[PDB]
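Subject: Predicted fold for Designed Zinc finger protein 5.3, 27 residues

User T.R. writes:
Posting the sequence so we have a shared reference for the thread.
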Amino acid sequence: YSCNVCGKAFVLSRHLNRHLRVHRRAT
Ligand SMILES: [Zn+2]
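User M.O. replies:
I've generated the structure tokens; pasting them so everyone works from the same file.
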């Protein structure tokens, strides 16, 4: 699993989803 927005790889999908939420921000 990897954050498509950057390329940061994660082992767990749940962690990646949390990381995706951070990209769903404006600032
Ligand atoms: Zn990311």
